[PDB]
Amino acid sequence: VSSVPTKLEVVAATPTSLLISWDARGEYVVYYRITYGETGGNSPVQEFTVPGSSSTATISGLSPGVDYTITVYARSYYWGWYSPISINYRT
């Protein structure tokens, strides 16, 4: 019964790849999943995944300048998910 990993920031890319520098005030039980898609609808979503207060992470940003959208995922108390949050700003 709650809301998201509730900060948003991507400072720079390495405009192949990209940094994703977001909230993590401790964890909870602790866990993060992080979506991995464009906003294209095609090129399936994939998955990165992290631990501690570690959504403060970074991508394999394979493909070029194209619009990319990606979310991260609380995990806590119930081995399930305590809410997600995304922005979408690319290369």
């Binding site: 809301s3 509730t6 900060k7 948003l8 920031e9 991507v10 720079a12 949050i85 922005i87 700003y89």
Partner: protein, 459 residues
């Protein structure tokens, strides 16, 4: 091509409450050291051929020029105050305090090579020489620039809520002044060498405010990782090689006002002798309370670099205005009492004796350059001072001197009372920074869009 300096004004919301008032007590402790200074200019007057500064404002050559490098960390350590470890901000705060003694032993070794003013090509106050008890201020005071670099590395780790240097560098001066005269001639004391020994005495208190550092791993959690300050990790270990190009660009750009020392001191001795050398009871009143000015931003230059790690992207660079313009309030509302007032009968015969019977063709640049620069490098103390951007900020300055080459031979070739007339394209050299820079402070607080890549969050 009307404004390629984009969305100018806006550095405003309700910022009336940007309170970097303890970033002025970063330079009210700097009146505190700027001011032993003369109490041995006029302390070594006991000795009359103690004109003694004869090195001391041509030693503060490889002080303030290596200084730049060192006061070039203020980012490094403010910026990682939105990280966590003052001890990897301090493994730097050491690796530099290595520097702050490594370059400090060049301060201390290049000073050696120094001492051959036994040389000539033009007029007095730049060649002559029979009696030099300067010989030794050149060393009893040029041996310090080692312990004097760590003793600036010091406030380059005042960047995070203390001005416990205003604490020490005030009890510093006062311990020096007593001690200053002990050598000029003194007590039990080594009581002899005085024309030099004001300087052995001053440099005495460097070494003492070098451990006004040591004495402040004291009131809270550490900044002491002075384990072996060594380096190697590649061909040459950075966090060191890193300070490098926050270094070269700083000093070599403190090497504007370093030729503004072979400009302002190469226009007194054409046939212009008299009140053209009293263009310095003037321009040392630039220095004087240009410092507390200027250096609000070389004190502010924290609350900007500090607040880039503390991930507030232009919640700093649009306080890089609200402090740009706040002593800029007094940048102009006391360029008022600058072109206004003069050396009256409050000026007896102190820092460079010449008070009763000369001209005011001296307050004629107390406006020229005065507020149209005041701030225009308190820009850089938030450019550099914020970012990388001294890289060629450097070449900020390759103009404010090369733009001011010909407003050199532009008093000597003049239309009127052109005393302030080589302060021509050197007050116009010197407000093509009202552009060049605060040009990159809106390429630049417009990189804290590009950088701030998500605009806010949820609840």
């Amino acid at each position: 091509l009307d404004r390629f300096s984009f969305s100018v004004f806006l550095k405003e919301i309700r910022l009336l409450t940007a309170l970097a008032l303890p970033m002025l007590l970063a330079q009210v402790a700097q009146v505190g050291i700027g001011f032993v200074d003369t109490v041995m200019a006029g302390g070594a007057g006991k000795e009359d051929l103690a004109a003694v500064a004869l090195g001391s404002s041509a030693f503060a050559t490889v002080y303030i020029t290596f200084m730049g490098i060192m006061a070039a960390l203020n980012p490094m350590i403010a910026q990682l105050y939105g990280a966590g470890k003052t001890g990897e901000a301090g493994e730097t705060g050491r690796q530099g305090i290595w520097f702050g003694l490594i370059l400090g032993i060049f301060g201390m070794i290049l000073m050696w090579a120094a001492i051959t003013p036994f040389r000539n090509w033009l007029t007095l106050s730049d060649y002559v020489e029979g009696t030099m008890a300067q010989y030794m201020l050149f060393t009893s005071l040029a041996m310090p620039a080692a312990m004097v670099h760590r003793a600036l590395h010091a406030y380059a780790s005042s960047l995070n809520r203390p001005r416990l240097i205003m604490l020490v560098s005030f009890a510093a001066f006062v311990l020096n002044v007593p001690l200053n005269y002990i050598f000029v001639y003194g007590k039990f004391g080594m009581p002899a060498l005085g024309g030099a020994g004001c300087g052995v005495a001053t440099m005495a208190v460097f070494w003492f405010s070098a451990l006004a550092l040591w004495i402040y791993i004291a009131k809270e959690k550490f900044f002491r990782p002075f384990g072996l300050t060594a380096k190697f990790g590649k061909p040459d270990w950075a966090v060191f090689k890193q300070i490098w190009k926050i270094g070269a660009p700083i000093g070599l750009s403190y090497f504007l006002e370093a030729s503004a020392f072979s400009f302002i001191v190469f226009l007194i001795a054409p046939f212009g002798e008299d009140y053209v050398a009293a263009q310095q009871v003037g321009i040392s009143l630039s220095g004087i309370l240009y410092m507390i000015p200027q250096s609000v931003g070389s004190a502010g230059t924290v609350r900007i670099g500090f607040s880039l790690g503390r991930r507030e992207f232009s919640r700093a660079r649009y306080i890089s205005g609200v402090s740009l313009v706040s002593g800029w309030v007094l940048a102009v509302i006391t360029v008022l009492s600058l072109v206004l007032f003069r050396s009256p009968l409050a000026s007896m015969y102190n820092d460079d004796p010449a008070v009763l019977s000369i001209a005011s063709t001296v307050l004629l640049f107390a406006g020229l350059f005065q507020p149209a620069d005041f701030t225009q490098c308190i820009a850089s103390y938030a450019l550099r001072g914020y970012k990388v951007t001294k890289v060629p900020m450097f070449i900020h300055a390759a103009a404010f001197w090369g733009c001011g080459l010909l407003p050199g031979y532009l008093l000597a070739y003049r239309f009127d009372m052109g005393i302030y007339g080589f302060w021509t394209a050197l007050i116009a050299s010197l407000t093509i920074a009202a552009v060049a820079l605060v040009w990159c402070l809106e390429k630049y607080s417009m990189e804290l869009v590009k950088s701030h890549k998500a605009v806010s969050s949820g609840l």
